[PDB]
Amino acid sequence: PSWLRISTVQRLVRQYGIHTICEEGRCPNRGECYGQKTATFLLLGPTCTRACAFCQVEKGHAPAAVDPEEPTKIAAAVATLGLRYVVLTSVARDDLPDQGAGQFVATMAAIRQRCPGTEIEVLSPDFRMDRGRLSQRDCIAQIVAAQPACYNHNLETVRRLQGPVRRGATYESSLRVLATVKELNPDIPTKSGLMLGLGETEAEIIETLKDLRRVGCDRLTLGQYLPPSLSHLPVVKYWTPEEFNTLGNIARELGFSHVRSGPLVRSSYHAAE
Ligand SMILES: CSC[C@H]1O[C@@H](n2cnc3c(N)ncnc32)[C@H](O)[C@@H]1O
Ligand code: SF4
Ligand code: SF4
Secondary structure, three states, X not given: OOOOOOOHHHHHHHHHOOOEOHHHHOOOOOOOOHHHOEEEEEEOOOOEOOOOOOOOOOEOOOOOOOOOOHHHHHHHHHHHHOOOXXXXXXXXXXXXXXXXXXXXXXXXXXXXXXXXXXXXXXEOOOOOOOOOOOOHHHHHHHHHOOOOOEEEOOOEOXXXXXXXXXXXXXXXXXHHHHHHHHHHOOOOOEEEEEEEOOOOOHHHHHHHHHHHHHOOXXXXXXXXXOOOOOOOOOXXXXXXXXXXXXHHHHHHHHOOEEEEEOOOOOOOOOOOO
8 A cells, every 4th residue: 555654762762671562563653753752661561461463562471570670660761761741551461460550550650750740641451350359440540540641541443343353352341441530530531542444344433433432532543453464363454544534533523632543543643742
């Protein structure tokens, strides 16, 4: 498809022994982003045990050990890069009693102590593997209590494609994450993104936007699914820039703000707005 086509961050992240979901998945947007003094740090990895077929994070049989210095190392990187807006995400940690929620909270505290004024957005997993543990709701509540600038949780695809696309997450559980944020503190903006091109139809995309608005999702991103080289999950369709633009407008008309819609968009792209 024709329309689909420096190292100072790269140096520091490599130097502090930390990880960005960014400089891992070779994100077409860095430098626009880097240029804007943002980046997305990946906590609790670098490997994930879940099986999402679209995701380029290295898979592993065992969870990586939790680094108690990861929060402070991220804060140091933020301070040294002079980042103004930071996104924190993580791999799913179904093995941990709090499913990793504490690591977000610690990292946010470390950043605020060292870099006052830097705004922090969270892209969380679903925390749904709750059985006999701290509840999904309380994992979310721990993070919401730290007052992120935005709480992002991606629905990724429409209802029909949840199984093959995100074997291990669900439509309802991910909707619930977004609903829960607004129940706990309606003043925290919420965000969700979808990847297009996996076989979903425009009718289904609209239904999914309506479902997001029903749980009060303030912000939307739409981008194109790009299959990882050895992924068994095929791309079905390349959505055109015009199609993304008309969907972007539809989203705005349904009440989303900070809408970002385009082939190379990801939920962290231009998050600072
Ligand atoms: C912003 S970094 C994480 C998000 O980027 C998006 N993303 C991950 N992998 C891909 C991919 N192969 N193609 C398009 N978007 C992706 C997914 O929505 C994910 O939650
Ligand atoms: S859980 Fe999040 S990090 Fe792990 S595979 Fe799925 S998308 Fe990647
Ligand atoms: S889009 Fe998100 S993930 Fe890609 S570069 Fe910008 S911050 Fe990193």
